[PDB]
Amino acid sequence: GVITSDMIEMIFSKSPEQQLSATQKFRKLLSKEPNPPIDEVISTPGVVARFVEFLKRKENCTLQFESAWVLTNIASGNSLQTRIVIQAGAVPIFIELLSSEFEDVQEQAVWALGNIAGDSTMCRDYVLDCNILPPLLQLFSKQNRLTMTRNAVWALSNLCRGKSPPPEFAKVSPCLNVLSWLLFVSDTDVLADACWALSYLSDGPNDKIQAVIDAGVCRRLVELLMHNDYKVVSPALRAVGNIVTGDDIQTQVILNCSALQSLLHLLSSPKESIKKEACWTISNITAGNRAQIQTVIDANIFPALISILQTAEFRTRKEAAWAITNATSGGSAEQIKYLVELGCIKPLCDLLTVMDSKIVQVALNGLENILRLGEQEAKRNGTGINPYCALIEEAYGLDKIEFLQSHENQEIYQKAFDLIEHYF
């Protein structure tokens, strides 16, 4: 039906003319937009191995090209369909083909390996075990072709992709330098996939983020936060937000690049995804020392966080709430004063009637920091009464705290009781 007998005949014919004819018939039939017939070509036991064998024909450049195209498309399907390609032995042949004299061939080779490594952690690590990156990284030495550089950075991103489990870090870490100078390219696709690779490598312990910091990319990452195309801004924001998951020294590295300035702009972006990830980045920042909190203050971020907390979608409001709560946990007595001056009590109180229990606890401790500080200001005893006990009451705060007595969660209920007794 879909695969005429003429095709298989020519495929196993020893005439290169007919070999090529049938191979490109397969190629065309696999370039179908809706659903190419991958299961149909796999159901003919001896064709996939036949294509693998065609890949070794250095004599003919066109034949390896068409066969690699066929195999890429087969490798673009389900996990079983690419396991067919793998256990047919195509990965080492493709890697050897990276060093080919013919440019079309090596482009298709890196594309095939990108699909294969983009399968799963097992395929990714298997392609790594075949020494893919030493010949893959030399491909960037030729800044001549663009399509090739795109395919190469995308395959790299696949090699870094995956967190369950992460790739062997020593196996993929040597690509950090090439990514480091790949951020200064003009093309948006290469920048986007380079930022994705950096975002994957930055997801891990402080050691891995310290390595990528030692690659010297934070400055260009933050400069890409202001990119016009969101295909670039999304992964760049993700990579920066990963770096700021480290200790104070390595997040201070991001701050020294003047990143808060552009994060403020991203707090107004129409895409709620970017708003959310920027709020998350800023929350991690405000979990640090008093100086990092203060540079968030001097960047005029908390006005925007309070606004976002009032009007944004709940997914975003969560990260905004974490931001201001973190600022209240380890902040100066004057910094939280700036916060309550800005009027953060009403948003936090507004967050108590919500379904999510964990961020209700967030708002609770963020209010308890203000209450405890206010009690500490009352400890001075210039005035006996806690000044914030009235400001939280004017916001209908203790009303919702009282309602939190009947809350199912024992943690929330008990905390509400402690607060109402200690401060009221």
């Binding site: 065309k28 370039s31 179908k32 937009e33 190419p36 195209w69 890429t72 498309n73 490798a75 673009s76 399907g77 594309w111 990108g114 699909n115 983009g118 399968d119 995308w154 696949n158 992709r161 997801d203 993700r238 937000g241 990963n242 700021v244 998951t245 480290g246 998350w280 929350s283 991690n284 979990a287 974490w322 973190n326 946990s329 380890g330």
Partner: peptide, 15 residues
């Protein structure tokens, strides 16, 4: 310490 962490294939067509 207080930090919260975060929480593939291309088909080729001539057309």
């Amino acid at each position: 310490r207080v930090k919260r962490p975060m929480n593939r294939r291309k088909t080729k067509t001539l057309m």
